[PDB]
Design a protein around this ligand. Structure first.
Ligand SMILES: Nc1ncnc2c1ncn2[C@@H]1O[C@H](CO)[C@@H](O)[C@H]1O
Ligand SMILES: [Mn+2]
Ligand SMILES: [Mn+2]
Length: 525
């Protein structure tokens, strides 16, 4: 570089897009608004002589029907128009077969990066480990890393010949290689690993903090993350603010000299890290999370309430709208067809389905047993992606709750196998996607044993067999559930979760929430 010269670098970032290419019902976020905000930042940055690097922390796939139904094509194309420079491959990029991810890479005009994903049979990387950028006299390298929890929590069949090596360990190797061969002035890691206060990842694979702490001091200017889906704004050292408020200051985390940032989720913010480089020192001169048309609720004493923007409205870029419109409208009428109605809200929020039994769980499972003639049922709470509210229900509503495209399957097992299976599944505690959801089952589980085990209300008869219904995911060992696909009575019906659910609600409508209310038949202790 040039001695005594000050260089300006602005790093913009988003992560966990999850198919939100379109603004939401309240006019929030969307890529058309993101386009405008970023074009605007590019102009200010260029007028000052700096350069912009726009990075994604991954998890573009799954989360909005119109996106899901089309393999996030609208999302990846929108990203080309916004002008992303690189992206870290996220675990949900493995929600579809690999050919889908390969098609997404063909769509993306920016590289999809990951240094630690390897093909088992060859010991070679499935993706590029980094991209290089030459800006003025500087060379910037961006490494990509993917959480090694990807296969552990994902569809077993996709990973038979794929391994996710430890991200932190790969990061050590890649950085050293870069320093030895490319000699970048700055290295940034885009990662899909998670920010856990003080490195307290608990049950989750270790993420950004632990990695920053294990790498050589200042070896990365910053880590642009994702996965945990948090706005990384510190309330105190090693403690993120809870209920971060859009528009307020956001102090990014810094560990072992390495900044760590995250822009929450779904295009809600575009983070902006403003750096100055001079004679080797990298100074972050400003950091903020820019809300993309986020709104708050204001409530008047007359009881009326309305949605008000935190910051000046950002206009939707029309070229983006023109690009995304066809994808947004493809089959709209169908998705929005009324298929039924519910007495009340069907609890489907992670905080619930991941910790306690809920009626959405009873509902989905009811749909599944009914279609399979099953006596009892179970699914991963991590399979319930959304709740359903009182009122009409559209197919779109359902594709929002179950977006993975899982298949409903059943197993006819001896009461013997039943107890053994339920005992196993019951061993997975709350705060996990592997958490269980039950229907027509009950017990007083204790110390790993199943006390007072029953199916529908009658104890388990070892001699008698029973039919259990679930998804292929769980049946194949997803969330580490006991493999059912390679044992005695097992059947894959081919019926897609969403479809089975749609059908079941069309015929069972009007839905009476009281019928699906858990009463504590499952308890543990
Ligand atoms: N391909 C998939 N099919 C079904 N459920 C999935 C899939 N990938 C992840 N999940 C669910 O999401 C959780 C992680 O958010 C997993 O523990 C699992 O319950
Ligand atoms: Mn995510
Ligand atoms: Mn993720």
């Amino acid at each position: 570089y040039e001695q005594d010269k000050t260089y300006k670098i602005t790093v913009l970032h988003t992560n966990d897009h999850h198919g939100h290419f379109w603004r939401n019902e309240y006019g929030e976020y969307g890529l058309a608004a993101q386009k405008t905000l970023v074009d605007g930042i590019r102009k200010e940055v260029a007028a000052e002589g700096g350069s912009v690097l726009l990075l994604s922390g991954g998890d573009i796939n799954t989360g909005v029907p119109e996106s899901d139904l089309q393999d996030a094509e609208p999302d990846f194309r929108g990203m080309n128009l916004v002008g992303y420079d690189a992206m870290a491959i996220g675990n949900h990029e493995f929600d579809n077969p690999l050919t889908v991810l390969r098609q997404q890479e063909k769509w993306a005009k920016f590289p999809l990066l990951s240094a630690n994903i390897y093909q088992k049979s060859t010991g070679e990387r499935l993706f590029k480990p980094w991209a290089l950028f030459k800006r003025q006299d500087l060379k910037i390298a961006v490494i990509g890393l993917t959480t090694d929890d990807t296969a552990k929590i994902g569809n077993p069949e996709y990973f038979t010949d794929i391994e996710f090596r430890k991200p932190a360990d790969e990061a050590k190797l890649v950085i050293q290689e870069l320093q030895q061969t490319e000699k970048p002035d700055i290295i940034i890691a885009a990662t899909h690993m998670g920010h856990y206060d003080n490195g307290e990842h608990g049950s989750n694979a270790p993420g950004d903090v632990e990695m920053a702490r294990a790498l050589p001091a200042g070896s990365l200017a910053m880590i642009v993350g994702g996965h945990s889906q948090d706005p990384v704004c510190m309330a105190a050292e090693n403690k993120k603010q809870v209920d971060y408020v859009p528009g307020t200051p956001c102090k990014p985390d810094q560990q072992n000299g390495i900044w760590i940032v995250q822009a929450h989720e779904w295009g809600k913010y575009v983070g902006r890290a403003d750096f100055e480089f001079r004679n080797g020192e990298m100074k972050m001169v400003n950091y903020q999370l820019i809300p993309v048309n986020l709104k708050k609720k204001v409530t008047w004493e007359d009881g009326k309430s309305e949605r008000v923007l935190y910051t000046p409205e950002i206009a939707e870029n029309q070229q983006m709208i023109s690009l995304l419109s066809p994808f947004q409208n493809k089959g709209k009428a169908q998705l929005e067809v009324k298929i039924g109605e519910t007495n009340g809200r069907l609890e489907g929020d992670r905080d619930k389905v991941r910790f306690v039994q809920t009626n959405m769980g009873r509902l989905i499972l009811a749909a599944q047993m009914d279609r399979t003639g099953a006596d009892f049922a179970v699914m991963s709470g991590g399979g319930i992606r959304d709740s359903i509210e009182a009122g009409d229900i559209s197919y779109k509503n359902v594709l929002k709750v179950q977006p993975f495209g899982n298949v409903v399957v059943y197993a006819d097992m001896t009461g013997k196998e039943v107890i053994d299976y339920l005992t196993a599944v019951a061993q997975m505690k709350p705060d996990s996607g592997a958490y269980p959801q039950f229907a027509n089952v009950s017990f007083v589980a204790k110390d790993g044993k199943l006390n007072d085990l029953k199916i529908k209300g009658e104890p388990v008869d070892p001699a008698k067999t029973y039919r259990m219904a679930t998804l292929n995911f769980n049946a194949t060992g997803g969330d580490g559930y006991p493999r059912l696909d390679n044992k005695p009575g097992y059947v894959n019906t081919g019926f897609i979760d969403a479809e089975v659910l749609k059908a079941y609600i069309q015929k069972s409508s009007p839905l009476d929430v009281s019928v699906y209310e858990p009463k504590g038949e499952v308890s543990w202790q």
